[PDB]
């Protein structure tokens, strides 16, 4: 990271940097060349250089798979590695002999190379381009004029092979393959190298990046999160960070919103004590080895000099072979590292997300709870999971169900289209319109189907479940799925007693609903015995009273239902957690609670089970799940409310807190332990006097929500208790402590 010293020009209203008229300019400038010897003498970096020396050896003919995967090419070996090390040596020695060998060794094969149609072949093709780009840029003054021309024509030939095409007009700028290596690393790298001879490639590659990719990312970056789920976070954010490094090292400074530094903190918050990461979007499961975000933590931690991110990298400081050079060039070995233990227990991601991640600690006894609005849907690997909550404690308890791969297949599978990516897979809300259709004609790259199953769930946005080209198309289309209404945590910023999130998710559904709102209130109970609780309060108004309403709670093992109580336990894989839901609304007289699951019913969608068993040896804990509970109104009605209170504890915990519903004036609420929480009876803003009664011993902590921001007066037993308290705009809430009595509130 250094200040920009390049010239900037507008191209069609969009400011862009001009590559400096000097080589090297790819991945480094002369400015950092003398530091290469220090890096070579850096013992942390010597090992990575040794790794690359080993990479110089050709593939053993018998070891070659013959189906040359993207993984084949990313496990980089042979000539391309050799010429890269030659170019590096030329930078450090300036010896005309070494720089020439790099050039003469690569040119012919760069012109002639062939690639059998194979899985993500663009990646191998793009990496082969990168090899040439390194030699071209780093040994530039050694190039003969005829060779430069030969290199250019070879690069154009190779570029045309890429899935984005050349010109790079195909695919999408926020998600999909064009949001991976092909543009942000590969085409951009070549462009920078050959700019003095063929400026077109840079103008096309950087052109699209600055116009689309950059604008789209800068839009959500301030909220410090990513939208492709907890696996594809890796490749997608890695390539964002490649563009960051490539352009800063070119001389363009940081081109992104610097909030980029804080995106990977989400992964940190979602890490479990078993080494796995809380689920979200397209993910598979394992208990074999911990999940790591090595490349993003390397690139982001080193650039932004972030100790929390460097800790993450140091967990497994082992970069994929094709990335070794980039670790050598860009890693900060002087940077320290910090365990996450002193991070606030709750973190909030605002627009366009509206996601809360709440913990009760950083150790083995941690409850980890996720609450999501989703203001927009990004599609691709994101799920239609507006309103979803997810809870982990000593095992996955309230689960995000299904699996990316399995017996059903991969991304294009019936399981993905009909269960995994759909609302029914999640702890959210269904409203079933028998006449609703779900257009899926543009989903996936093969095995296309025109329509998906009716899950009573959320819309499939886009032109048949097609992601938008860019931010412009996204904002103009039907990708809006919600509105964050309220959020906060406290009273303490470090160890909040409560974590609150409210969203209106009507836009996530068709016109089968008039209104859908969900309010989450997580309680850190500050107790080893019953460490946490979550209260979920829903308003659902269907356009037709006969549209069946569903409240879902997914689990791995079979739930036990007794009255208004659902008990879920983990008893396998060393997990011992327990979840207990008390259903308060609909009331027992209007409540049907039903469990669906087990063999043939694990992925049940209104008449069809979308079977997806794990690949042998994978998902040993069955985190894809086998069970769910559906809470449904007995009586058909346009307007229904759900109120559910979840307690979390060890499966050996016998005594859980008594849960009381509070039926007040204008409010409905919950009381358990020393906590009182209220919501508007209509889930709409309360702007007039209201009240309720409290019965019980000791001091209670009150969170009153859905209140008109401004000054409130609190009375108890007809006497003013708090003459003036402020409800603020962000949470629309009153907070205070008090004892039992009859409460009135004035505004």
Looking at beta carbons only, is 634 or 688 nearer to a second copy?
Answer: 688
* 742 touches a second copy by CB under 8 A: no
Cis check: omega of the bond before 691, within 30 degrees of 0: no
Of 38-46, 202-210, 376-384, 478-486, which segment contacts Zn ion by CB under 5 A? 376-384
**Side-chain half-sphere exposure of 93, counting CA atoms within 13 A:** 12
Task: Examine residue 666 and tell whether it contacts a second copy (CB under 8 A).
Answer: no
Q: Are 213 and 179 in contact (CB under 8 A)?
A: yes
Min. distance of Cβ 464 from Zn ion in angstroms? 21
Nearest approach, Cβ of residue 735 and Zn ion (Å): 33
Find which of a second copy, Zn ion, none residue 78 binds, CB within 5 to 8 Å per kind: none
Beta bridge partners of 358: 346, 369
Cβ proximity of 56 and 81 under 8 Å = yes
400 makes contact with Zn ion (CB under 5 A): yes
Question: How far apart are CB 711 and Zn ion at their closest, in Å?
Answer: 25
Residue 678 CA to residue 668 CA, distance in Å, equals 6
Contact with a second copy (CB under 8 A): which of 587, 730, 739, 742? 730
Site for a second copy in 573-612 (CB under 8 A): none
The structure tokens listed for 186 are 């590969």
- Give the shortest CB-623-to-Zn ion separation in angstroms: 11
324: contact with Zn ion by CB under 5 A: no
Task: Choose which of 720, 737, 739, 742 interacts with a second copy (CB under 8 A).
Answer: 720
Stretch that binds Zn ion, among 342-350, 394-402, 632-640, 720-728 (CB under 5 A): 394-402
Q: Which residues contact 43 (CB under 8 A, 6 or more apart)?
A: none
Q: Taking contact as CB under 8 A, which single stretch among the options 281-289, 310-318, 501-509, 726-734 is the one that binds a second copy? A: 726-734
d(CA 640, CA 682): 10
Q: How far apart are CA 267 and CA 175, in angstroms?
A: 19
Our CB check for a second copy shows the closer of 109 and 495 to be: 495
> Residue 523: how many CA atoms within 13 Å on its side-chain side?
27
Q: How far is the CB of 521 from Zn ion (least distance, A)?
A: 22
Residues serving a catalytic function are 177, 232, 381
Minimum separation from the CB atom of position 277 to a second copy (A): 20
The secondary structure of residue 376, as a DSSP letter, is: B
400 binds, among a second copy, Zn ion, none (CB under 5 to 8 A by kind): Zn ion
282 interacts with Zn ion by CB under 5 A: no
DSSP string, 260-293: GGGTTHHHHHTB-TTS-B---SS----SSS----
Window of 102-110, 398-406, 523-531, 554-562 that interacts with Zn ion by CB under 5 A: 398-406
Residue 79 sits in the site that holds a second copy (CB under 8 A): no
Q: Where are the alpha helices (DSSP H) in 139-187?
A: 145-159, 181
Taking CB under 8 A as the criterion, the residue among 442, 464, 689, 738 binding a second copy is 689
Q: From the list 23, 236, 347, 675, which residue makes contact with a second copy (rule: CB under 8 A)?
A: 347
CA distance 364 to 436: 45
Span interacting with a second copy, options 32-40, 93-101, 202-210, 221-229, rule CB under 8 A: 221-229
User: Which string of x and - marks every residue 243-272 that binds a second copy (by CB under 8 A)?
Assistant: ---------------xx-xx--x-------
CB of 331 to a second copy, least distance (A): 19
Q: How is residue 155 written in tokens?
A: 């690069």
The three state secondary structure string of 446-514 is: CCCCCECCCCCCCCCCCCCCCCCCCHHHHHHCCCECCEEEEEEEECCCCCCCEEEEEEECHHHCCCCEE
Q: Which one of 218-226, 228-236, 310-318, 587-595 is the stretch in contact with a second copy (CB under 8 A)?
A: 218-226
Q: Is 308 in the site for a second copy (CB under 8 A)?
A: yes
Q: In sequence order, which residues have a C-beta less than 8 Å from that of residue 179 and are 6 or more positions away?
A: 172, 173, 213, 236, 239
Enter the DSSP assignment of 184: I
Residue 238: name the closest of 198, 159, 293 by CA: 293
Q: Which stretch binds a second copy (CB under 8 A): 347-355, 382-390, 438-446, 574-582?
A: 347-355
**Nearer to a second copy among residue 242 and residue 348 (C-beta):** 348
Sheet holding 560-562, edge to edge: 483-490, 498-504, 513-524, 532-542, 639-650, 577-585, 565-569, 560-562
SS3 650: strand
* Closest CB to Zn ion among residues 422, 517: 422
Closest CA to 104 of 57, 59, 151: 151
Interface with a second copy (CB under 8 A), residue from 450, 688, 695, 739: 688
Among 82, 271, 359, 383, binds Zn ion (CB under 5 A): 383
Distances (CA, A) of 734 to 54, 253, 488, 678, 745: 64, 45, 12, 10, 10
Is the CB of 24 or the CB of 597 nearer to Zn ion? 597
Q: Shortest Cβ distance from residue 728 to a second copy (Å)?
A: 5
Q: Does 89 bind a second copy (CB under 8 A)?
A: no
What does the per-residue mask of binding to a second copy show for 349-378, with x meaning CB under 8 A? Answer: -x----------------------------
CA-based nearest residue to 281, from 239, 227, 242: 227
Measured from the CB atom, is 661 or 728 closer to a second copy?
728
223 binds a second copy (CB under 8 A): yes
Stretch that binds a second copy, among 13-21, 217-225, 400-408, 467-475 (CB under 8 A): 217-225
CA distance from start to end of the chain: 53
Nearer to a second copy, 251 or 732 (CB): 732
Rounded to a whole number of angstroms, the minimum distance from the CB of residue 682 to a second copy is 18
Residue 224 sits in the site that holds a second copy (CB under 8 A): yes
> Strand, helix or coil at 556?
coil
Is 708 one of the binding residues for a second copy (CB under 8 A)? yes
With beta carbons less than 8 A apart as the criterion, state whether 507 and 482 touch. yes
By the criterion CB under 8 A, which residues form the site for a second copy? 222-224, 258-259, 261-262, 265, 307-308, 338, 342-344, 347-348, 350, 488, 493, 687-689, 708-711, 713, 720, 723-726, 728-730, 746-747
By the criterion CB under 5 A, which residues form the site for Zn ion? 383, 400
């Amino acid at each position: 990271q250094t200040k920009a010293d390049v010239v900037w020009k507008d191209v069609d209203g969009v400011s862009m940097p001009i590559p400096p008229k000097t080589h090297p300019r790819l991945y480094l400038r002369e400015q950092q060349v003398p530091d290469l010897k220090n890096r070579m003498n850096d013992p942390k970096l010597k090992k990575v250089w040794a790794d690359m020396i080993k990479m110089q050896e050709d593939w053993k003919p018998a070891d070659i798979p013959e189906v040359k995967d993207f993984r084949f090419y990313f496990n980089q070996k042979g000539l391309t590695v050799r010429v890269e090390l030659m170019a590096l040596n030329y930078l450090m020695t300036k010896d005309p002999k070494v720089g020439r060998e790099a050039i003469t060794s690569i040119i012919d094969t760069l012109e002639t190379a062939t690639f059998k149609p194979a899985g993500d072949i663009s990646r191998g093709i793009g990496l082969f381009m990168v090899t040439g780009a390194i030699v071209y840029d780093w040994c530039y003054d050694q190039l003969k004029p005829e060779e430069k021309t030969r290199f250019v024509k070879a690069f154009v030939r190779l570029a045309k092979m890429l899935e984005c095409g050349y010109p790079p007009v195909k695919d999408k700028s926020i998600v999909g393959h064009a949001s991976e290596w092909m543009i942000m690393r590969d085409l951009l790298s070549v462009g920078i190298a050959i700019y003095d001879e063929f400026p077109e490639m840079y103008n096309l590659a950087a052109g699209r990046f600055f116009k689309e990719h950059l604008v789209a990312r800068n839009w959500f970056y301030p909220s410090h999160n990513y939208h492709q789920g907890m696996s594809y976070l890796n490749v997608r954010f890695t390539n964002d960070l490649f563009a960051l490094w490539i352009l800063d090292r070119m001389g363009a400074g940081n081109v992104f919103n610097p909030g980029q530094q804080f995106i990977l903190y989400d992964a940190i918050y979602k890490r479990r004590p078993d080494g796995q990461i809380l689920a979200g979007g397209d993910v598979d499961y394992s208990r074999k080895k911990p999940k790591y975000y090595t490349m993003p933590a390397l690139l982001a931690g080193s650039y932004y000099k972030d100790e929390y991110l460097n800790y993450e990298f140091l967990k497994d400081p082992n970069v994929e072979p094709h990335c070794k050079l980039f670790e050598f060039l860009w890693r900060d070995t002087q940077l320290g590292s910090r365990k996450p233990d002193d991070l606030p227990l709750s973190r909030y991601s605002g627009s366009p997300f509206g996601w809360m991640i709440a913990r009760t600690g950083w150790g083995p006894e941690s409850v980890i709870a996720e609450m999501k609005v989703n203001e927009y849907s990004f599609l691709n690997h994101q799920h239609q999971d507006a309103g979803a909550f997810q809870i982990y404690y000593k095992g996955p308890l309230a689960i995000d169900a299904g699996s990316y791969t399995g017996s059903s297949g991969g991304y294009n599978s019936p399981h993905n289209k009909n269960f995994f990516k759909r609302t029914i897979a999640h702890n959210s809300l269904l409203i079933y319109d028998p006449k609703e259709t779900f257009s899926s004609s543009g989903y996936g790259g093969s095995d296309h189907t025109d329509f998906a199953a009716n899950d009573g769930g959320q819309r499939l946005p886009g032109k048949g479940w097609i992601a938008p080209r860019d931010l412009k198309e996204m904002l103009a289309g039907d990708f809006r799925t919600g509105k964050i209404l309220a959020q906060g945590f406290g009273p303490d910023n470090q160890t909040p007693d409560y974590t609150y999130l409210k969203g209106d998710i009507t836009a996530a559904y068709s016109a089968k609903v008039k209104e859908v709102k969900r309010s989450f209130l997580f309680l850190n109970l500050k107790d080893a015995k019953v460490p946490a609780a979550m209260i979920v309060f829903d308003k659902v108004v269907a356009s037709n009273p006969d549209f069946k309403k569903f409240w879902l709670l997914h689990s791995i093992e079979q739930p036990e239902i007794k009255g208004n109580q659902i008990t879920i336990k983990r008893t396998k894989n060393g997990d011992s957690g327990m979840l207990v839901n008390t259903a308060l609304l609909p009331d027992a007289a209007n409540s049907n609670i039903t469990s669906i699951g087990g063999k043939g019913k694990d992925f049940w969608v209104f008449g069809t089970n979308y079977t997806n068993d794990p690949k042998p040896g994978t998902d040993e804990a069955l985190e894809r799940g086998e069970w769910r509970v559906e809470i449904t109104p007995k009586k058909a009605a346009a307007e229904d409310y759900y109120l559910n209170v979840i307690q979390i504890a060890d499966n050996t915990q016998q005594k859980l807190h008594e849960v009381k519903r509070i039926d007040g004036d204008k409010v409905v609420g919950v009381q358990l332990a020393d906590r009182i929480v209220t919501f508007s009876k209509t889930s709409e803003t309360v702007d007039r006097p209201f009240g309720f009664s409290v019965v019980g011993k000791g001091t209670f902590k009150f969170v009153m929500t859905d209140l008109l921001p401004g000054t409130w007066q609190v009375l108890k037993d007809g006497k003013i208790l708090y003459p003036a308290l402020s409800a603020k705009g962000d949470d629309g809430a009153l907070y205070f402590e008090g004892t039992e009595g009859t409460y009135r509130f004035l505004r």
